[PDB]
Amino acid sequence: MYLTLQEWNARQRRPRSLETVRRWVRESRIFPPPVKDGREYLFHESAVKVDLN
DNA sequence: CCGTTTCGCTCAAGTTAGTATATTAAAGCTGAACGAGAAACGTAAAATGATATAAATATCAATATATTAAATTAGATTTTGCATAAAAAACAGACTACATAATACTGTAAAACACAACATATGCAGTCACTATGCCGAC
């Protein structure tokens, strides 16, 4: 039902580095926000990179 | 015959009189689309009606006499309806043997990300020009 960090970024237009994407998570730059499974984050299929300011 | 006024009528805004239901549950009605077998029809071919005349063949009464198909039995027998029961095969009721998954437990690489000092393009911060009629002023 959810999508892994890589499976979500791979679908993006400008696939950034893993670290950078992980940073948009701690900075709540992604809404709807992703949930932490065990060691990886599983975002939503409709989750988008909300760039504000 | 004619006009004028009262009266029968209907429109418009108040003043009263009367009666009281919603969901379940299960049908029932009817316009419209769907899917074969048997007999009346019809053109074509085969059998028959049409048609007549001297000669050939059948029409039939009344009774004697040899002949024969065949229903009428009458006894013989395959045929037909119905189980009984055991030989023979199917198949749960047991069980160890065998190969196979879910699980028990040790061994090892590596995914996934916080944490931390830099590095720096890029968006944001701050000011002037691009581009063209307002407003204000005359006509």
* CATH code where residue A37 lies: 1.10.1660.20
The burial of A34, by beta-carbon neighbours within 10 Å (0-12 exposed, 13-18 middle, 19 or more buried), is given as: buried
User: Is nucleic acid strand B under 7 Å from A42's C-beta?
Assistant: no
- Whether the beta carbon of A19 falls within 7 A of nucleic chain B: the reply is yes
Query: Looking at the DSSP assignment, which residues form a beta bridge with residue A28?
Result: none
Q: Which residues span the domain enclosing A32?
A: 1-53
Q: How many domains does chain A divide into?
A: 1
Q: What Å resolution does this PDB entry report?
A: 11.0
Strand (E) positions, chain A?
30-31, 35-36, 41-42, 48-49
Sequence-distant (6+) residues with CB within 8 A of A7 are none
- Nucleotide with minimal C1' distance from the CA of A51 is B123
